Design a binder for this molecule. Structure first.
Ligand SMILES: Nc1ncnc2c1ncn2[C@@H]1O[C@H](COS(=O)(=O)NC(=O)[C@@H](N)CO)[C@@H](O)[C@H]1O
Ligand SMILES: [Mg+2]
Length: 409
């Protein structure tokens, strides 16, 4: 009796998905269909268990049950990807970003009142007056948002990368530079569906008529994607992990949904560098490591003396993989606001189950920005500006051969 009535256990999982999907403001539409296909998959699986282990020529009904079950097994698995990860209980339940929960704030806001004068400028106005970047000729060669890095733009970019990578290595992180493009089947298991339409550049195979074949390549939007897919069909023991990765790479993003938004300077671009945190933990250690990864990012920007605030993103705005995401918004005197510099998410076993990173039980994947070089430079520039030039943060001065100040060209 209770054996068949164990459907309470299966119905209890559908309840947790329903509560999370409602908090994501997804309307529980894809969920109601997944419940029906799951039963029909259980109906087809029970028929496929017709072992026939003992003059019946039923050997023709066996291929009919196998292929028909796979036709519904792929339809059922295609829906389990559209369902978002179950949110954690302390996630703000709201559909607008104006309800993002501010957790803590560090640093006093500077006295710069951006008005277009040399004493208070926007990041693009300072960097263009310092010969940092070239967007006129960069857009001529690569289209909108294209740019060159020049002079101390390259020097500060290299200095900030060394200080960022060294920051994680001193905390026991493992340095890693991944491939900058991935194949279709691997990228599909690491990136959301919206990433393909909005973000990922597509390099199709020759003579494929531009279609997405199995040999299609996609440039990485972050080192999170190749480092996550790096654990494909990998089993790890409790003695092997936790693993902390210090990823560094260039990032390619189409920004197709950010049309017209932030097009001056190098705040939002198609190509940028980023030093990344990626951690593989036990399910028990996931929440403890998530708070560690965000405090490491807090510590990094405290040493840059950039005021910031750490907020928790609302439920209706999260990606499908995040069970909870923390954002570090640093102070930009130009925009007179806090602007996003670091995202730190606890994805639990969303991608690891897709990638079959077994421990059925799976590992928990977490990712977090440490420093997006190009955008952090925009924040450094707006805070360390003077009417006579740019000041260099003390932590970066050793990496720049000792320079303390840069005058306007
Ligand atoms: N188009 C862009 N141009 C410049 N910097 C960007 C761009 N897109 C994102 N960034 C920077 O990169 C950070 C991380 O981007 S994210 O997609 O939000 N998060 C990730 O990629 C995670 N893997 C954590 O790093 C952002 O907070 C921002 O500082
Ligand atoms: Mg983000």
């Amino acid at each position: 009796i209770d054996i068949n009535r164990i459907r309470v256990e299966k119905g209890g999982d559908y309840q947790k998905i329903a509560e999370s999907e409602m908090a994501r403001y997804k309307g529980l539409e894809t969920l109601e269909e997944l419940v029906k296909v799951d039963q029909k998959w259980r109906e087809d699986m029970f028929k496929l268990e017709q072992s026939k282990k003992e003059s019946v020529q039923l050997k023709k009904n066996l291929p009919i049950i196998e292929k028909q079950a796979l036709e519904t097994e792929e339809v059922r698995d295609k829906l389990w990807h559209k369902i978002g990860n179950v949110l954690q209980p302390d996630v703000p339940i709201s559909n607008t970003e104006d309800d993002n929960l501010v957790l803590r704030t560090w640093g006093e806001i500077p006295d710069i009142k951006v008005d277009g004068t040399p004493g208070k400028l926007h990041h693009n106005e300072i960097m263009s007056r310092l010969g940092f970047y070239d967007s006129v000729k960069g857009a001529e060669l690569a289209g909108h948002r294209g740019y060159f890095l020049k002079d101390y733009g390259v020097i500060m970019s290299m200095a900030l990368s060394h200080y960022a990578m060294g920051f994680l290595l001193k905390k026991g992180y493992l340095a890693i530079q991944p491939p900058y493009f991935m194949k279709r089947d691997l990228m599909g298991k690491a990136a959301e569906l919206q990433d393909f339409e909005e973000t990922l550049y597509h390099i199709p195979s020759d003579n494929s008529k531009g279609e997405v074949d199995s040999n299609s390549l996609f440039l990485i939007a972050t080192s999170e994607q190749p480092i996550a897919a790096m654990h494909h069909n990998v089993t790890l023991e409790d003695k092997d992990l936790p693993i902390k990765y210090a990823g560094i790479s260039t990032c390619f993003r189409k920004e197709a949904g950010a049309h017209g938004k932030d097009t001056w300077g190098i705040f939002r671009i198609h190509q940028f560098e980023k030093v990344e945190q990626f951690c593989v933990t036990l399910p028990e250690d996931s929440q403890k490591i998530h708070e560690e990864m965000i405090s490491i990012s807090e510590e990094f920007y405290q040493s840059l003396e950039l005021p910031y605030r750490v907020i928790s993103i609302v439920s209706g705005a999260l990606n499908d993989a995040a069970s909870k995401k923390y954002d570090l918004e640093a102070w930009f005197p130009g925009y007179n606001s806090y602007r996003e510099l670091v995202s730190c998410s606890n994805c639990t076993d969303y991608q690891s189950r897709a990638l079959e990173c077994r421990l059925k039980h799976y590992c928990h994947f977490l990712n977090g920005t440490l420093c997006a070089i190009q955008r952090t430079m925009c924040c450094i520039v707006e805070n360390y500006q003077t009417p006579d030039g740019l000041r260099i943060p003390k932590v970066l001065q050793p990496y720049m051969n000792g320079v303390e100040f840069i005058p306007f060209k």
